[PDB]
Copies of this chain bind each other. A is one copy, B any other.
Amino acid sequence: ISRLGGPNFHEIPINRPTCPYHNFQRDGMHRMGIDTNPANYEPNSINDNWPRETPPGPKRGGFESYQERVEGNKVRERSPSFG
């Protein structure tokens, strides 16, 4: 944010994805993309809810985190296995 002057550093040419990118984020310093979507929020009915979420799947699916088991108290402690 400070090094590259704002939240649109992904629009600087070298950083841009070569695949499609569409979402409801808007504005910010040096905004290049000019959004035509009637909606800047979801859920919406005014743009029939696009762009839309995509379920996880074998190919071209949405990102879902691996459901790792978490168990313990909230601590600021180094694991004894690291000592």
Contacts and interface: CB of A to CB of B under 8 A. Distances in A.
Interface residues of A, number: 26
Contact of A67 (B64, B71, B75): B75
Interface string A40-74: 00000000000000000000000011111111111
Nearest to A8: B30
B73 A67 contact: yes
Instruction: Choose among A1, A12, A74 the residue with the greatest number of B CB atoms under 10 Å from its CB.
Output: A74
B6 A32 contact: no
A30 B13 contact: no
Interface of A: 1-2, 4-6, 8, 12-13, 29-32, 34, 64-76
